């Protein structure tokens, strides 16, 4: 509702925009920037001007404790954001490797990316599977985590949709022609 219309009135928007950054860090279910990206909010609130909004988006991409340690701020690190950074690291890297590589990542790579043991990577994979950010049976050393792709990917999900539309239009019309000779 705030991201749609009313309280714009930018002073009212600023105070809840700062609260929205806190709300994203407050629940580790809130991904990182994904909820803001998904509809009007990122297309309504300034990135750098006062909000500090794109800083979180930069920390998410550059994927490290060092980026949070550079970019964090007194209110959230006092309580504080130490555990949640590891939960963030687990979701972002596991998605990013599989998204780029492209889609059947080696165990050996994943240990280097997550910076933890083999059995620790398998433990991270279990709750990645419980989250359903990845979702099929896990093989031993290669073909480690596959499918779902639920997370944000901006233009790399928009371009995928444009490719899927082309695929859907060919497939649905062609299969309708076959089933219209067989009904």
């Amino acid at each position: 509702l705030l991201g749609s219309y009313t309280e714009d009135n930018a002073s009212q928007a600023r105070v809840d925009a700062h609260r929205c950054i806190v709300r994203a860090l407050k629940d580790p279910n809130a991904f990182l920037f994904d909820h803001l990206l998904t509809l009007k909010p990122v297309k309504f609130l300034e990135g750098e001007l006062i909000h500090d909004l794109l800083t979180i988006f930069v920390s998410a991409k550059l994927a490290s404790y060092v980026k949070f340690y550079q970019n964090n701020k007194d209110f959230i690190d006092s309580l504080g954001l130490l555990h949640e950074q590891n939960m963030a690291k687990m979701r972002l890297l596991t998605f990013m490797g599989m998204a780029v590589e492209n889609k059947e990542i080696s165990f050996d790579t994943m240990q280097q990316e997550l910076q933890i043991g083999a059995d620790d990577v398998e433990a991270f994979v279990i709750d990645a599977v419980r989250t359903k950010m990845v979702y099929c049976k896990i093989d031993q050393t290669q073909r480690k985590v596959v499918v779902s792709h639920s997370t944000h990917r901006t233009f790399g999900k928009q371009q995928w949709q444009q490719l899927y539309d082309t695929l859907n239009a060919w497939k649905q019309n062609l299969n309708k022609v076959k089933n219209s000779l067989l009904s």
Binding site: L167, W170, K171, L174, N175, K178, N179, L182
Partner: protein
């Protein structure tokens, strides 16, 4: 199948041996009966036509064939849908 085999062993198999025996005996006695000729042939419990079991059987096999047909019709279209979605 057991019901048909039971009637066949009464219809054919008993009668075949009775004619086998009656042809050996030869089969007409002119001064007086015909004692064992009089004894021969008396109906077993199926002499023919156990239709009450048979017709009810056939209606059930027709119901079974309808279940095979509906299962086949489900399989025809499931195979088509499975092939159609994958290859594009």
């Amino acid at each position: 199948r057991n019901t048909s085999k039971q009637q066949q062993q009464k219809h054919q198999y008993q009668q075949r041996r009775q004619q086998e025996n009656m042809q050996r005996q030869s089969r007409g006695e002119p001064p007086l009966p015909e004692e064992d000729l009089s004894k021969l042939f008396k109906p077993p419990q199926p002499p023919a036509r156990m239709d009450s079991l048979l017709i009810a059987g056939q209606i059930n096999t027709y119901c079974q064939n309808i279940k095979e047909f509906t299962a086949q019709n489900l399989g025809k279209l499931f195979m088509a849908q499975a092939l159609q979605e994958y290859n594009n």
